[PDB]
Design a protein around this nucleic acid. Structure first.
Ligand SMILES: [Zn+2]
Ligand SMILES: [Zn+2]
Ligand SMILES: [Zn+2]
Ligand SMILES: [Zn+2]
Lengths: 553, 199, 53, 305, 198, 199
RNA sequence: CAGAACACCUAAUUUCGAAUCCAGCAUGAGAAGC
């Protein structure tokens, strides 16, 4: 029941359409660039048809590049990802559209299209199951980039795990072990494969660099690698969108590795903001390390420093990312100092994918290898077959898995009231991996956040509502961020309570009364601790607490 | 007869558009979120009544021209059966030749229907006295219908087109006084044979 | 309902002013004449009263 | 599917009715070793394998019935989807493990509870799911979960409803809705004094009633449905006809309309109101007479009633 | 039977702000601007026009000493007998003057910019609060085609008086800060309501 | 009411005046050349926010005299609704009776808007360190505003004139500390009827 | 294994999301074969 729309090389369009009868759920609607094909992309999106939802795994263009184009032909109803993926998609779509206007290629979608994609853009974080058109959808972290998820869709005809891109051990800002469904996985759609050296050549260039990174993941991991090792010389970020992504991962640090959920980059990262500071740092002859994101030396800011760095016989150029075909970066890496680092790789190797399949609870019925290069997909598929699991490659491309519901109780004692065969029963809806109703005799056969009491939460929210610090708008926004999930509400409450060091203002509503600063700050800390203790509670309990003060949501 | 007239009518919405929900269960399920729901399908599209708008338009213009056209808008009024609109849309004796469809949209509710907020500004004090949220259909939304005339005459396409220009002038449904429902129409008719499907 | 909520707290565990009837109809008639108690209001109060006290 | 073995797609029986039985060791046709091992038969490609196993390749699913295992067994080298295995312990393990393309779901059969449970736990620790066996489709229309004793549980008491095609599970909101609907249907069945003792009326002559009823039958105020419901409300008593004519003649204060059908003619507003009160007074004088007299009044305008 | 067409054309003289009412377009736009402007899905600018016209005529006719109802009071029932109920509507009868939204002649990117407004402490003289709102530039042209179904002689004069009151006071929001000071051009014509018949 | 108050305000500036541009697109089209762009109209005239300066002026004076005025300059401060500045300029529920128009300039951009270069010297070395090319309105420029009071009271024109005598003393616009914005006001008042356009 | 371009500091917050009318008529109740 799943169609791989261009799921071989991901160029000129790629998509995973899981049609389940009542829903045309769509996964990984993105574009890969090779660097006239746009018409074939257009024909493929018109070939997709009406999709009820455009699930998004991660914020790269491979999975998120055709979302406003599906909005343009109006084929998608709802677009859901993580909030980190949503704002990184904002930066991606704006930069991609600016690149389409700069290169004079006919624009695929429009800026208004990007906006109207964000009209219908819902968001949830990990481990938040949503019941959409009898499909239960859950997100899990797969350690690729920030906000990157693997999708777990339970339909009545089976459980599908769209893995997306899987992270490696060398990813420092995230947990290494990718989160998995705790239940049965029937079909697993897996995408195949495709540090001290950097520091020591930074010594042999500085005391005697230029680093081309990628703005999502790669530049922030180079920055964090330089943050852990404090050497002697300084680091500069000469990249606008890389600086915005760095600031957002500082904002979205609750979505990161658990150790890094407590600043993060411990200062000392002078970021160049405008192009005049860029020309200054290009003409600066001081020994310093310049990390910046253009990609493969083809367009961006890097090119302000390239000339200065290129002719310099003391400088070096540190390729921490893959260089694709027909790019200036590839033309300088092959030869037509030069160092290439292979540890800075967001994509997992083959053995990490074997680890990913092996720590499933059950062995999947069929592993659908989709993207990656051909020969690596071939050898990976052979190693899946050596683990006795079925493989369907997209070039080569069937039981039926029905999740039945059984009554398991007596139905003889039934009556009629309104031409209905109704009977009252008290039982237990046990849920195996075959929802089962079972009577009470079966049950007898079987049988970071602070913490506050419920009455203290009630009295503190009532006090701060009378003091006007907590508001109906505040409770409504907190309920929206809490229905998003716990971590999004943690980020919202931390963002409200955080005191701006330049101005001394918190985003809390000011108290109404004759309170002196100290009392105002103690009331703000009371609101912070009270709503974190509310965050620790259950969702229905939070709804029953917040419906007293704000009658709607 | 041996020929039938098919008028494919395409509507592009130019102003905001509202047509209120008529199903009591769906309206009562929507009053916990919006005070004015849009008349919507169970397949999540938007339908607009279209026969009454065309009949009202044609009756107003033909009464203005001076023709002997009845007013079936008065309370429990009966059509006489001799008017041109009685021949087209219907009478109590015989059914009408024109079979007007609902205006089903080409897009689903999550793509064309938005939830908006209207107020009641007090004349002095300039404050929000009342505030109500209502659903509406955006501008640029495309609706489709097929008007099916069983026994075509020479003046059936012309009167339908004149009624469509009157609906463009005055609005199709809902809050026509506040500026809602100002739309535009494309017409592609074709006289099809009645025995077409037999083959 | 007193039975049902009974099991709805049991199984989960295992895992007013006075007015005369003449005064009420007189007051409802008076408020209906000045349109405080509308038909819409009496209907919604009836549906809310059918769901319990 | 397999019912505890009958495996439809047909209804082939492996070791009931309308079947192609395949006996094991250790209807319309009986297939056994004629076809020996390593040879395939059609019916759904069926191949038998020696035990010391029936292999049906269908359109959807490749089923394997093992039989009793004693010694190295013999297993197919193709693709297995279901593995029906007896359990009465390490021999079954490697019989599973040494087979390529390990099956989607295995089935345990022909044993007690403890041995089947121990083997089942050993197969979940090998990461292969098990099923332990011992019709209208059922629909949960419910919506909170629990995790007591490693089962996902929900305390729910509700109703089961049985239609001709499905059995649904509903909560108290459905029962409240149908109870309110049936209460509204029950209360709309009676009026307080229907068909009871005969109950402050204007009086008018029979000829004037004939004249007025004929005049309001020519123009469309007193019509055939009006006379029909008037006679039906007159049959259930005098006060019921009083209530019906007061409901029909009632002018709404918000709209200024009554439930009479408007006259067909060129009458102005005052004359239309005079005709409405003429109809009200004429029918009020008509409720005075006896039932046979009113029937003789109204048969000349509505022959049905 | 005749009908009256009043083609009005607004030129904006002081910057115009009408807030966006659509909840989706609001929450999509409340991460970039704190005060979105009312916008079509076809990227034009929307202004309500019937309420401002009715408010202008209600204030002025109440000041003149006429027996007009105040429909601005909360849950106010219009009388159905006054001039404003005849023109704009009552609970029994619909209004004769069907008044359209003020569709701008230009797209958002040509007439709509994003301004930043402040809130400054009176003692400190420092910018305490900052916010951003969308506003319509000056010289932007809006249009409407006010249609009167059953016209009398005085309705065009009342519409022009209401338009002069809008030029006095303002349309849209933020009127006390100086927003919405506009000018109107009126072209009036009586049209037969059988004129599309061919 | 039956009565409104018109206050025609003519501002003759005496010092150079600066009010920074607020529109983001018109600032990015400017900060290549003018890094402090003047708040300008799209009809190339100079715009000054006039409300708020009056409200800050009257709040400072009325706090000095001792009236029970709330200060709306604190962060997210809610107006009380009881003091005379809340009645004049605005409360959070009742709107302000005094609607204060912007200070439009009568002359176009090319005749008043001028580019200046301000500096920052190293002090002890007496050598220029920073150089930035701002933009400002010249002196003798005439600005116009119209303050409309809907329900006038007797203590309305005097309070507005007092607030303008404050704004003359400390300046309007930006950079009031270094000597920008020193202005003078000519006030012509006229009590006009609320029903003067009807007939 | 992918997008990339004189200086700051700020770009937050709140309140409303309701009320009312209407839910009626009219016509047809028969033929014919077996
Ligand atoms: Zn990726
Ligand atoms: Zn007729
Ligand atoms: Zn009135
Ligand atoms: Zn105050």
């Amino acid at each position: 029941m799943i169609k791989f729309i261009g799921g071989a090389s991901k160029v000129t369009g790629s998509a995973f359409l899981l049609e389940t009868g009542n829903a045309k759920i769509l996964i990984d609607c993105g574009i890969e660039q090779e660097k006239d094909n746009n018409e074939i992309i257009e024909k493929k999106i018109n070939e997709i048809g009406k999709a009820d939802i455009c699930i998004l795994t991660h914020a790269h263009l491979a999975a998120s590049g055709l979302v406003p184009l599906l909005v343009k032909k109006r084929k998608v109803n709802k677009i859901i990802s993580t909030p980190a993926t949503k704002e990184l998609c904002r930066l991606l779509f704006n930069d991609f559209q600016r690149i389409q206007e700069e290169n004079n290629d006919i624009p695929l979608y429009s800026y208004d299209d990007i906006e109207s994609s964000f009209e219908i853009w819902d968001e949830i974080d990990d481990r938040n199951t949503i019941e959409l058109f009898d499909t239960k959808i859950t997100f899990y972290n797969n350690s690729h980039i920030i906000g990157s998820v693997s999708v777990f869709i339970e339909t009545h005809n089976g459980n599908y795990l769209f893995s997306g891109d899987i992270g490696s051990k060398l990813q420092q800002l995230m947990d290494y072990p990718p989160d998995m469904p705790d239940g049965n996985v029937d079909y697993l759609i897996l995408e195949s494969t495709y540090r001290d050296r950097l520091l020591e050549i930074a010594k042999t260039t500085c005391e005697n660099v230029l680093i081309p990174s990628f703005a999502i993941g790669r530049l922030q991991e180079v920055l964090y690698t330089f943050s852990n090792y404090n050497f002697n010389f300084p680091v500069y970020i000469d990249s606008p969108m890389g600086s915005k992504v760095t600031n957002l991962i500082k904002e979205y640090n609750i979505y990161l590795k658990k150790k890094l959920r407590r600043d993060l980059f411990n200062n000392k990262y002078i970021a160049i903001n405008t192009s005049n500071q860029s020309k200054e740092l290009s003409n600066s002859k001081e020994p310093a390390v310049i990390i910046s994101a253009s990609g493969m030396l083809e367009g961006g800011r890097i090119l302000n420093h390239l000339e200065q760095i290129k002719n310099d016989e003391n400088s070096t150029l540190i390729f921490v990312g893959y260089q694709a075909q027909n790019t200036r970066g590839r033309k300088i890496l092959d030869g037509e100092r030069i160092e290439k680092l292979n540890s800075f790789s967001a994509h997992a190797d083959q053995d990490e994918l074997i680890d990913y399949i092996e720590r499933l609870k059950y062995t999947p019925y069929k592993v659908f290898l989709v993207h990656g290069e051909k020969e690596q997909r071939e050898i990976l598929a052979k190693r899946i077959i050596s683990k006795k699991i079925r493989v369907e490659l997209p070039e080569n491309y069937e039981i039926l898995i029905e999740k039945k519901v059984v009554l398991n109780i007596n139905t003889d004692n039934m009556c009629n009231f309104a031409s209905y065969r109704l009977m009252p029963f008290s039982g237990f809806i046990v849920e195996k991996d075959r929802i089962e109703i079972n009577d009470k005799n079966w049950f007898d056969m079987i049988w970071a956040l602070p913490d506050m009491s419920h009455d203290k939460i009630i009295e503190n929210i009532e006090y701060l509502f009378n003091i006007k610090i907590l508001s109906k708008n505040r409770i409504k926004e907190f309920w929206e961020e809490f229905c998003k999930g716990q971590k999004a509400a943690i980020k919202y409450i931390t963002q409200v309570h955080r005191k701006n060091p330049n101005t001394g203002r918190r985003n809390w509503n000011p108290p109404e009364g004759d309170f002196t600063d100290n009392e105002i700050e103690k009331l703000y800390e009371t609101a912070y601790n009270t709503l974190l203790s509310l965050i620790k509670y259950d969702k229905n309990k939070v709804y029953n607490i917040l419906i007293n003060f704000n009658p709607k949501l | 007869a041996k020929t039938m007239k098919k008028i494919y009518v395409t509507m592009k919405t130019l102003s905001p558009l509202y047509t209120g929900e008529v199903r009591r269960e769906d309206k009562e399920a929507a009053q916990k979120r919006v005070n004015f729901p849009v008349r919507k399908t169970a397949t999540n599209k938007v339908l607009i009544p279209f026969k009454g708008a065309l009949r009202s338009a044609l009756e107003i213009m033909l009464k203005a021209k001076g023709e002997n056209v009845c007013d079936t808008g008065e309370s429990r009024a009966r059509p006489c059966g001799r008017c041109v609109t009685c021949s087209l849309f219907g009478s109590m004796g015989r059914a009408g030749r024109a079979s007007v469809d609902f205006l089903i949209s080409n897009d689903t509710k999550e793509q064309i229907v938005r939830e908006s907020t209207h107020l009641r500004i007090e004349r002095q004090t300039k404050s929000a006295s009342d505030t109500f949220k209502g659903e509406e259909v955006i501008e640029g939304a495309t609706f489709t219908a097929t008007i099916t005339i069983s026994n075509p005459q020479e003046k059936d396409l012309s009167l339908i087109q004149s009624a469509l220009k009157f609906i463009e002038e005055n609005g199709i449904g809902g809050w026509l006084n506040k500026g809602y429902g100002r739309v535009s129409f494309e017409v592609k008719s074709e006289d099809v044979a009645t025995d077409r499907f037999l083959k | 309902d007193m039975i049902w909520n009974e099991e709805y707290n049991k199984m989960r565990s295992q895992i007013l002013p006075d007015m005369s009837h003449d005064k009420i109809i007189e007051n409802i008639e008076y408020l209906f004449n000045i349109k405080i108690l509308s038909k819409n209001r009496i209907k919604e109060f009836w549906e809310e009263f059918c769901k319990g006290q």
